[PDB]
């Protein structure tokens with residue numbers, strides 16, 4: 001058996017999405033997500049100009065060998081661009097293998113460990129009053145868990161957002177106090193610090209959030225230096241989550257082994273496919289750390305398909321982030337998974353259950369779009 | 385003052401090179417290297433399609449701000465492609481800054497700490513005898529330091545596949561160095577590149593066997609994604625350790641340095657985010673007496689070498705600089721102010737990093753796909769080349 005083509009397909013039905021389709025001399029084919037929000041074309045070139053030509057002629061059934069080949073062979077290892085390409089390949093290969101085996105992907109990983117996949121919604125508001133109402137809305141819809149984010153009163157090319165930590169420190173804890181007073185403690189409440197705090201400030205925020213029993217406080221402080229979470233972990237029992245921007249297990253080995261986090265957010269597209277995410281989930285499992293896969297809209301339905309198959313099997317499953325795609329996106333990427341009363345469900349279609357309608361995809365041309373950047377009040381470049 | 389253009393130039397005068405040229409509304413312009421061997425076009429896209437557009441209109445004098453902007457603004461941080469793009473931008477801006485100051489770059493970093501820059505050459509051979517001969521040649525050319533690599537007897541359009549067997553290497557390599565010292569004595573720095581082929585225990589074993597031959601260093605003995613991998617090596621041998629040519633940020637070497645597991649950090653100006661970031665890596669290293677030993681193979685353009693030599697000229701904890709000669713064509717395409725003489729490199733007094741690019745001449749050498757090799761164990765196992 002041989003790979004006869006590895007094509008990259010770009011479409012923009014609501015936002016940019018890059019897909020890889022691996023074709024074989026047998027007919028069966030597979031697709032993988034390679035979308036890197038804000039730097040999409042870098043992965044396209046990585047795949048088309050470099051990886052693709054090497055895949056031709058290889059035996060697609062050798063998922064592990066090809067993963068190692070693309071990972072080690074690159075010589076310059078790890079990285080956002082590099083791992084996205086590897087993930088796209090890995091996803092396409094597992095898709096092919098599941099199809100050939102005639103089973104939905106989760107069966108190959110080890111079968112299902114659960115039925116539905118708990119997810120959390122995005123309750124946003126310009127202020128507390130508005131955010132509180134938004135959480136009520138997600139509660140009405142059947143969500144067992146809701147992430148609450150609020151604007152802080154007083155706070156194409158990349159947009160520029162402002163930030164001031166002291167204002168956030170004084171406001172955010174009031175949001176959650178109001179949420180608990182209003183809705184009680186029967187719901188999982190989450191918060192994304194979005195890399196804005198130093199370890200000490202994160203420790204301060206976490207301790208102030210303790211009486212509100214949050215499901216987790218995410219990406220509280222930049223994690224390039226994994227020891228950064230030590231101070232936070234030492235000063236608070238608020239659950240900690242991190243990892244959406246991670247691309248390999250090395251970005252989290254110390255956070256996990258030193259028990260500095262409760263949820264690992266790495267995704268199938270961000271951390272090199274099922275092959276590598278599995279290793280990350282395994283290490284986490286040893287320390288009772290659970291999966292809490294990132295799932296914003298900049299991850300295509302292909303990723304969500306693969307993520308749900310993963311979530312259906314993984315023992316130490318924690319939760320799955322869920323952001324709805326547009327109708328156009330859903331048309332370009334027909335899939336076998338659906339939402340129902342706060343839970344996602346993966347179908348029984350062989351492969352990861354997702355496909356790409358190339359003809360329809362061609363009707364939505366690439367359109368550049370950047371993620372925002374943040375600056376402090378004095379103009380200092382900060383973390384968005 | 386504003387950036388009016390940030391163009392990417394591709395040329396292949398002997399091998400592929402990617403260059404970024406930042407222009408301003410003041411006449412002065414700067415260039416930086418963005419070459420990532422075997423994956424060149426991904427950096428071209430990263431820069432061309434995403435970063436360049438954002439640079440238009442920014443104040444080129446704000447080197448730190450722009451570095452932080454591209455580094456943090458990317459959201460998805462670190463990585464070989466990401467850092468190569470950032471390094472190119474940084475090099476071009478420091479180049480512009482030094483030109484505007486009317487001084488060669490090293491003056492801005494803090495002035496020269498030395499005259500010449502010691503380099504080491506590449507003595508290779510298919511077997512010990514041939515390799516011993518090559519070392520003698522390099523010694524004849526006046527090299528004070530020589531890296532000696534030998535093929536082991538029992539062991540470009542697309543990735544070539546090379547074979548590997550650790551046991552055979554372990555039995556053969558120590559004999560190379562034993563022969564070298566017996567033939568040339570100990571009045572020469574001798575270096576060896578393990579090139580990621582060994583596990584930590586095997587590297588400890590190799591290092592220990594090499595101890596009698598006093599090596600200047602044993603480089604990249606074992607994969608370092610897990611910085612703890614050098615702990616076993618360091619605890620079992622006194623042979624000096626070097627690592628880092630494939631690193632792209634200070635976070636790839638933080639623990640290696642602070643836990644004193646290495647003696648030389650090999651990170652480069654193009655691999656680790658430019659002068660701005662490499663300086664931070666050098667500063668951390670000096671606190672533990674770790675010295676610089678910047679990688680410098682041919683896949684790094686003269687723009688990188690120029691920047692590296694300015695950095696080497698200033699940095700106090702300088703150790704050594706790798707030097708692989710570029711082809712005449714490459715030297716013609718990239719006019720530069722630095723030269724070699726009796727085992728040392730010297731950077732010139734030309735304002736900026738002293739390097740430039742002849743765009744008209746560069747256009748005469750079309751890009752040509754070329755990959756690095758891959759290695760597989762005897763049983764077919766994908767390994768580290």
Ligand SMILES: O=C(O)[C@@H](O)[C@@H](O)[C@H](O)[C@H](O)CO
Pocket residue numbers: 037192244294295296297298321371459
């Ligand atoms: O946790 C989250 O949902 C956010 O961090 C993401 O929306 C993130 O900002 C985007 O995925 C970046 O592309």
Ligand SMILES: O=C(O)[C@@H](O)[C@@H](O)[C@H](O)[C@H](O)CO
Pocket residue numbers: 075421577579629679680681682683706756
């Ligand atoms: O230390 C060295 O000289 C080698 O490791 C390099 O030639 C390396 O193989 C290449 O620079 C990779 O592009």
Ligand SMILES: [Mg+2]
Pocket residue numbers: 192194218219244
């Ligand atoms: Mg987040």
Ligand SMILES: [Mg+2]
Pocket residue numbers: 577579603604629
């Ligand atoms: Mg090397």
